[PDB]
């Protein structure tokens, strides 16, 4: 399945705060979260203060991914509304982040390959002396 496209949709109503983007957005990376609201309504900003989401498509730029998943969590939990978010680099490149494969990570979905899964109980990790002078950790085996 192909990821969601990212157009220029209007941003929520807000008078502006001091909790928004900084130089990190300019030099390193920032983030963008989009959602579709049934009506105009008030929501609390992750960066502090109250804003108004418009009806239809909404696009909000945040400084951290955690802020994005926080806002999105509040959207899905309180306003019963689906959301997505991407990471954006200064060169213009956009990386689709969440939800990765179109399905929320809470519920299982075929197609996902395991990462960092050790097929052994945690107590069966080797002692540090077993990995001395190697680059390996007892949990990397």
């Amino acid at each position: 399945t192909p990821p969601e496209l990212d157009p220029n949709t209007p941003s929520p109503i807000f008078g502006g705060s001091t909790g928004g983007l900084l130089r990190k957005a300019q030099v390193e990376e920032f983030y963008v979260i989009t959602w579709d609201s049934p009506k105009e309504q008030i929501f609390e900003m992750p960066t502090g203060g109250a804003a108004i989401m418009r009806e239809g498509p909404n696009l909000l730029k945040l400084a951290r991914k955690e802020q994005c998943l926080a806002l999105g969590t509040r959207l899905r939990s309180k306003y019963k509304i689906k959301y997505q978010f991407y990471r954006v680099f200064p060169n213009g490149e956009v990386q689709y982040l969440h939800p990765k494969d179109g399905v929320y990570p809470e519920k299982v979905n075929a197609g996902r390959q395991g990462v960092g899964q050790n097929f052994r109980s945690i107590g069966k990790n080797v002692s540090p002396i077993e990995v001395k002078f190697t680059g390996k950790q007892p949990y990397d085996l």
Binding site: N8, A25, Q26, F30, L59
Partner: peptide
């Protein structure tokens, strides 16, 4: 009336 532009990342992130 928007503030997001891939072609202009300068204005997008307030690099003024």
């Amino acid at each position: 009336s928007v503030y997001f532009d891939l072609e202009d990342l300068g204005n997008t992130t307030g690099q003024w």
